[PDB]
């Protein structure tokens, strides 16, 4: 069902479909070190990705249906240069007819043009003045389905946002050649990241789109805030999804000491451009291997690890005393060689029992493999203290809504630009 599907291979970019589309990569196209399958494009002429199809799959028909899907990561727009600057990122227009994907300040735009120079556009807009955004500098699964009989639809993360009727356009003659390069951007320090680019010759319904979104999500591997792979030996700032206005802090070191959620968060502001909340506040959480049999540094599902809390540029250990009053066990930061037999192993969970993908979860376990519980927060006399409790496990068993057991790991990123 897929005609074009750009994937990575041994030091090359290939097409998994049975067509062998020719791919030409420019001399300034970059790849990541850990997830090298994802590609990065910068604002230069040499930052070029070029794909050429066959004559038997060229979109030149009358009522032919089609759809496209990919993952896009766009950094934050920092100044007023980026305003009213629609620039194309994906191009399939020859002789002023075809389909294009472009970006503007807080907008992803899908445009299609016929041979009669008719314009039809579908736009997804995300705000940049939000406290914590789900789209700024984070991976977005964008899929567009075009029904030449009824209408064209945009989908982000499997959800419908906009849809526009496209009955007016009669015939589209898309190019034999597709362009991946920034075009029309006056910002010299602007770039994008794309991955998993697929084409289909039919309008995908919601079922197939959700299936593709979950299949490409790699639910067996944990993801950080930006959507990349979670890695051992990397400092991470901690964000609690249920209470995202406070950050993890400590007051003392030892069994008497505890860690809590201190707030409110600060703000990073560029006037009339962005008013975001600071993400580089709190104490860093390093993750260390304990029984990982994989050679890589990627944290996968059901991995038993250690947690180090970086306090005053010094590393400590996350542990509790299992035998104490109450169901919940208070989290504490101890000296690494002074942990003794305190419960410190954490099982990292990325999906539920049924296999449904969710956010990052930590399950504190003892040396007997007994579930002390999921790591969350509980309020003691108006102080949100970090605890490990079995109440979250009870709610999970009852298919209820847990409160405070979901976490996000925020490493320092260049696309965010906050001063630390």
């Amino acid at each position: 069902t897929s005609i074009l599907s750009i994937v990575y291979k041994k030091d090359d970019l290939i097409d998994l479909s049975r067509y062998g589309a020719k791919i030409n990569i420019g001399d300034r196209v970059y790849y990541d070190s850990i997830d090298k399958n994802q590609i990065k494009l910068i604002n230069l002429e040499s930052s070029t990705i070029e794909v050429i199809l066959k004559n038997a799959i060229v979109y030149n028909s009358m009522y032919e249906n089609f759809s496209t899907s990919f993952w896009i990561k766009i950094p934050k727009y920092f100044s007023k240069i980026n305003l009213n600057n629609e620039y194309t990122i994906i191009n399939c227009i020859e002789n002023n007819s075809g389909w294009k994907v472009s970006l503007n300040y807080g907008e992803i735009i899908w445009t299609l043009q016929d041979n009669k120079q008719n314009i039809q556009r579908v736009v997804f807009k995300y705000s940049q003045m939000v406290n914590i955004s789900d789209y700024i500098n984070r991976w977005i699964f964008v899929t567009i389905t075009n029904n030449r009989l009824t209408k064209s639809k945009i989908y982000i993360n499997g959800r419908l946002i906009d849809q526009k009727p496209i009955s007016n356009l009669g015939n589209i003659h898309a190019s034999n050649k597709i362009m991946f390069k920034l075009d029309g951007c006056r910002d010299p320090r602007r770039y994008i990241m794309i991955k998993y680019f697929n084409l289909f010759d039919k309008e995908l319904n919601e079922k197939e789109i959700k299936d593709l979104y979950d299949s490409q999500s790699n639910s067996g591997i944990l993801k950080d805030f930006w959507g990349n792979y979670l890695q051992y030996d990397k400092p991470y700032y901690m964000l609690n999804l249920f209470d995202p206005n406070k950050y993890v802090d400590v007051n003392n070191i030892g069994i008497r000491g505890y860690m809590y959620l201190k707030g409110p968060r600060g703000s990073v502001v560029t006037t009339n451009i962005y008013l975001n909340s600071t993400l580089y506040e709190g104490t860093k959480f390093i993750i260390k291997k304990y029984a990982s049999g994989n050679e890589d540094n990627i944290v996968r599902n059901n991995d038993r690890v250690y947690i180090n809390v970086v306090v005053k540029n010094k590393e400590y250990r996350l542990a509790t005393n299992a035998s104490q009053a109450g169901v919940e066990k208070i989290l504490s930061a101890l000296e690494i060689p002074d942990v003794g037999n305190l419960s410190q192993v954490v099982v990292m969970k990325s999906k539920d029992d049924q296999g449904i993908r969710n956010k990052c979860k930590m399950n504190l376990q003892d040396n007997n493999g007994n579930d002390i519980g999921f790591i969350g927060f509980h309020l003691y006399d108006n102080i949100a203290k970090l605890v490990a409790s079995n109440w979250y496990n009870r709610q999970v068993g009852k298919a209820s809504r847990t409160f405070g057991c979901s976490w996000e790991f925020i490493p320092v990123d260049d696309g965010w630009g906050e001063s630390s």
Binding site: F78, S79, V268, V269, T270, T271, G417, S419
Partner: protein, 592 residues
């Protein structure tokens, strides 16, 4: 019918005067005088609490504009309600009973307002305390009048007005002694804070409690018993008065010679009693506007409204204009630094009342600086750093911030006026009010002193009026004090400094007090004993409403011109004196 009722009322009025002259004046009258004096001192104290605690309560409760204005008027609105309510209820329940109820309500709500942490709850509690204290003056005067013989009634009633002055002095002294200790931060509850002004509120609620304690040991007025058909109780109270008086004199052997006293012939269930009380009170209020009392009532209404308007307007106008003069003097001393270029320095400071303009700061560290009335205009901060910055009345106008960090600063969003921030970071912002709250320091001291001078020039006027009320008369004292008040209002023009306005405030306060004394005695003497508290409470409620109107109008005229307040006060006082000169003379008459 009605003529027979008037005849029996006159016979009772004459017999009561004869009985009172038999009883004499002595220890009982002075004991009741001091008890009702405590009741009036509570009233005098009540009108200073919010004015004295506003500077601290504004910062402690985040009070904005139109929230410090409604707090400065809430006592008068509560008083306006309470005066009418308790004056109406006093003729159906009794002077002492309604006085006890009102004083208890005032004490309870004044104690409860001392611990309230919010604003709306504080406003409600203070309004209800004003309601409780609104019925003090009418009931107190109409309760003391029914124990006095005609021989010396103006002097004995006029000596009752020193207690408002005593209450004002007490409030000023306690405010001076308690509030300036800002260090007191007693903690009972994490989210609640207990400062010194709440202790001041408690100490200001004390005199009402003392008044209740003193009033619990006094007897109800015999005239109230006689009007309602209760003869044995009235006879017992008159016998007690005579016995106490004679024991004080030194002849505890004579016998009360009165045997029978003329009395006025009287012709689910909780709701029934409430409806009956409401109907009776409305009947008394309407009969106050009767064919017999319609001219007297209207002239009393005019006099009370005009005098209250003028007095309260000027009394609130004087401190506001003193503050305005101080503000002008302060703004005249401001320093201006046009053009600066600062680079590569950790530069801290404590500047007050300054304006920097056209500055250019590059990589500057501002650690631990206190800003008071400091304004930066047309400045540019690049790669700057602000830490431990304390700010008060500080603004940034037409400023540009580039790559600057605000760490542990109270520079909230309202202090950047039409500014542009680029890549700025706000971290660990201090706790503070969302809007500007201003700050008062040493000047509060002087404020208290001014109050102590505004309620001490009153004393010569009180002494003169008390000594001379019977010798010249109520009408002439009232007219001669209103005319002098109008003359002082004219003199108001020749004042432009703080000392001049303090002198003018002292003069006006010392002049109008005799007029107020005379009006109190007149409105006590001009009504029958079955409508005294109703009419007096209605007139006092009108006084409080006029006080609200005059305070608002005269506050709106501060800093605009001196012609409007002078003209308003002089016109109102002239009309009041003209209406007062048409009043019937009550001197040398039985308390009918």
């Amino acid at each position: 019918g009605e003529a027979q009722r008037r005849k029996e009322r006159e016979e009772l009025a004459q017999q009561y005067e004869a009985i009172l002259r038999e009883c004499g004046h002595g220890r009982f009258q002075w004991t009741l005088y001091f008890v009702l004096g405590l009741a009036l001192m509570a009233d005098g104290v009540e009108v200073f609490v919010v004015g004295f605690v506003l500077p601290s309560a504004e910062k402690d409760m985040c009070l904005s504009d139109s929230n410090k204005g409604m707090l400065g008027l809430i006592v008068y609105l509560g008083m306006m309600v309470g005066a009418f309510l308790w004056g109406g209820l006093a003729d159906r329940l009794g002077r002492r009973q309604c006085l006890l109820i009102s004083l208890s309500v005032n004490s309870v709500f004044a104690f409860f307002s001392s611990f309230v942490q919010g604003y709306g709850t504080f406003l409600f509690c203070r309004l209800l305390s004003g309601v409780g204290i609104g019925g003090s003056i009418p009931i107190v005067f109409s309760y003391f009048s029914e124990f006095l013989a005609q021989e010396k009634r103006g002097e004995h009633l006029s000596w009752l007005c020193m207690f408002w002055m005593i209450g004002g002095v007490y409030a000023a002294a306690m405010a001076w002694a308690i509030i300036p200790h800002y260090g007191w931060s007693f903690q009972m509850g994490s989210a609640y804070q207990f400062h010194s002004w709440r202790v001041f509120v408690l100490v200001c609620a004390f005199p009402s409690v003392f008044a209740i304690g003193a009033l619990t040991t006094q007897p109800e007025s015999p005239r109230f018993f006689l009007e309602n058909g209760k003869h044995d109780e009235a006879w017992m109270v008159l016998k007690q008065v005579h016995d106490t008086n004679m024991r004080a004199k030194g002849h505890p052997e004579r016998v009360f010679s009165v045997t029978h006293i003329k009395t006025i012939h009287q012709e689910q269930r909780w709701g029934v009693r409430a409806l009956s009380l409401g109907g009776q009170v409305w009947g008394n209020f309407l009969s106050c506007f009767g064919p017999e009392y319609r001219r007297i009532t209207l002239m009393m209404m005019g006099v009370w409204f005009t005098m209250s308007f003028s007095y309260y307007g000027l009394t609130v106008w004087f401190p506001d204009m003193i503050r305005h003069l101080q503000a002008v003097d302060y703004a005249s001393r401001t320093k201006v630094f046009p053009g600066e270029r600062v680079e590569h320095v950790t530069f801290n400071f404590t500047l007050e009342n300054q304006i920097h303009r056209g500055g250019q700061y590059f990589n500057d560290k501002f650690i631990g600086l206190r800003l008071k009335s400091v304004s930066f205009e047309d400045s540019l901060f690049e790669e700057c750093y602000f830490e431990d910055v304390t700010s008060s009345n500080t603004f940034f106008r037409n400023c540009t911030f580039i790559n600057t960090v605000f760490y542990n600063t109270d520079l909230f969003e309202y202090k950047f006026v039409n500014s542009r921030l680029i890549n700025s970071t706000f971290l660990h912002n201090k706790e503070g009010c969302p809007l500007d709250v201003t700050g008062t320091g040493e000047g509060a001291y002087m404020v208290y002193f001014v109050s102590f001078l505004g309620t001490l020039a009153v004393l010569p006027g009180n002494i003169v009026s008390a000594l001379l009320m019977d010798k010249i008369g109520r009408l002439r004292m009232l007219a001669g004090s209103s005319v002098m008040s109008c003359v002082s209002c004219f003199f108001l023009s020749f004042g432009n400094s703080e000392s001049a306005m303090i002198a003018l405030l002292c003069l006006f306060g010392g002049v109008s007090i005799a007029s107020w004394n005379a009006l109190d005695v007149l409105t006590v003497e001009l009504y029958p004993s079955d409508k005294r508290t109703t009419a007096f409470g209605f007139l006092n409620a009108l006084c409080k409403l006029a006080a609200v109107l005059g305070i608002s109008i005269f506050t709106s005229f501060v800093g605009i011109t001196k012609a409007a307040p002078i003209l308003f006060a002089s016109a109102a006082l002239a009309l009041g004196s003209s209406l007062a000169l048409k009043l019937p003379e009550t001197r040398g008459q039985v308390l009918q």
